[PDB]
């Protein structure tokens, strides 16, 4: 009497499509659930293994997906049902991609709790998040030294909206960032830093993928880029 | 080599005009600053004792003042400098206003903490807060076992907008409230919550104090008060 | 109602970890009772600070939930009243010697549990403390050289009463090949008791670690001659 | 820079606590140095778990910043080279013990502390270990017996070095009047090694209990006997 929820279905669809030879990845849950009084608002966070593209500057590195941002039961337990139409939701779910490193056999579980914050800012404020915002998370995001402090958020790469009963969802993934280029993005926009970033392949690549142990900013890596941010700002 | 913050002198300014008698409050500070790379947004928070009013049924209660969402500064160390006319960094400063309790002969100090976590929200998402705004906190205000679980945004009674010389600050007092109020304000609307509270003096009274020991919801305490939420709801 | 199978259990946890209400929690995607390929519904991760005072290190500690009886509404297991066992009777447990640096604990522990689960489930047979599984494989799929299991009752997880039947806590212990051959020729209980006065390779509370280089006996040769007798007299 | 000062007893209270980085931590608005009333700068308090072995409960530990040099610039104390005493030479310590249900420190504790400062300052000059002060009030305003206080040097906080002179930490601890007295006759080492001795009255940490009901004496009336001798043989 807790059938597979239609919403979680669809997105649980979109993972599959994506990852058809990994139908039992390993999936972190919220011991005591939101809706029961818990304090994290994502029931589940599953964690891939994507190989990647050899071919593309696209290394192999770990894939998170959430469930609780949007509608997954239908049912008014945590969201307000609201037609098939407008959003699931808050709209969307939360996904990042983590670089992997030599000698990990499973994805870490730290993105999780990263996740969990920013879901807990968006459930309490209430209000939601967009391509191109970014987040002053103000502290290195696996709790360790690295230079990787903030966020900026994009339509993830692969994950598709999906279609459901209870709402359409999208796919909002993190990309970490230095302090530097947050403040780039307040200076000229989101978008920007984001295509930048994707024209650096160890700062994200085509993919934004998040490597916690960058110890250089896109600029400090071609100083060139800050023409074009200079451009843009003066160009908007 | 670090005077008294000109930011921090208007709102102390404010504060001495309403405790003329409390020159030395009790003051609660992050050891480590969070523009030195602390976790807690605020600089510090000032805990006073508000007599109240006997007279008008306005119990005596603590009054919590916080010092880090405005500019304190202005030299662009935590917010940035935007002129004398626009806010002060954010704007405003959190309040609060805690029912005193027996056993009590200074505040407790566990509001700073919370304010902190609302805090450390309007600076990582950059949203600022509005008189009516309602936060989903999802949980007892002071990790006990108390229904006030989420909050509520209005204007202090009593502290008023201080002109500084770099930016407006104003004041939201945070106001506890039970789900049940807090879907009632989602239904409707923050302000119309905030009125009725102001006419329930257990419940918050003219000053909108909290109780973290109230045991019943304004609707619990007078079914009637339903009425006017509905009517609210559909002139609306 | 909370299903008062996964209530119980919870309840142990708490306990034991009361500063740890919200621990890492890994679950099955498409849980078993709808057709998922995975017995257990539930893997919860604790950290045990051990005991410094009696050289107990600090290690990771496993429990699972889905062999015993969760929801008692038949979905998995046969409901069998509150006296006999609930469910298969215990919920499997595991504790990881924890490696500098690790800030939660690893999760393959799942995987080896559902794979026994996956075993328990098929078997002709029950399991119980002093039994031996030949793994043959190292636990973890490194190059490790524990590569069997020993079960033991959990050293502080104590059996629980449930509305569903008695629940108790079997503990794998990580061996070697010349550990687990030493157990078929003794007795399971003989291997453990040795276990636990080896601190390195389990101590009192039989800690798995699953980077330890050598056999009990390598380490002190002269267990060889407990083991003997045991045989001997036995 | 940051106060040297400071830095090195924020480096004390780390190796202490090194998972409190964040503690609760108390100011005067108007520092001394701008002419505020209150001479202590910063108060932390922090939460000590004590020692359930040697029966040491859980307590507050609280420390002062402003009786010794913080900053280097002569703007409250004079600069005396890396030698000498740091200011003062020492801060304030104080052990509250920690009532069942108290989810933070007690402040009222500064209070006290910036009362002994404001003492120090106005000169019978620096106290040293052993030394009491005949506050005469009960010290959290409240109806308790403890109304005096004794100095010893911290059970736990090591003398630091400072690139403005060397500081040490005197804890505070409450005592009765009969105590004070007895510390008066005799000497205040003494005292305090018999409430040392008796766990409730201080412990080795020598905690202070607020709510103790009974003198060293009333609870075993022949620690007298050994304050005589203690009298005798000076």
Known sequence: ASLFPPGLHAIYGECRRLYPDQPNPLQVTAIVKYWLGGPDPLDYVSMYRNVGSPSANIPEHWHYISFGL???????RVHEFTGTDGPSGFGFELTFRLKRETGESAPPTWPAELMQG?????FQSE??????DHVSWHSPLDNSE????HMLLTEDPQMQPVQTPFGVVTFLQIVGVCTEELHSAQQWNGQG??????????AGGPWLITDMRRGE???????HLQERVDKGIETD
């Not at 690295?146 to 402090?149: A, E, F």
């Not at 900013?217 to 100083?223: A, S, V």
Request: with cysteine.
């Open 217 to 223: 900013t896109i600029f400090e890596i071609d100083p």
């Open 70 to 76: 949007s509608d997954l039961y239908g049912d008014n």
């Open 127 to 132: 209000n939601t998040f967009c391509s191109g």
């Open 146 to 149: 690295s230079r990787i402090q």
């Open 193 to 202: 830093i984001l295509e930048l970033l994707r024209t650096v392949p160890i």
């Open 118 to 122: 920013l879901a807990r800012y968006v």
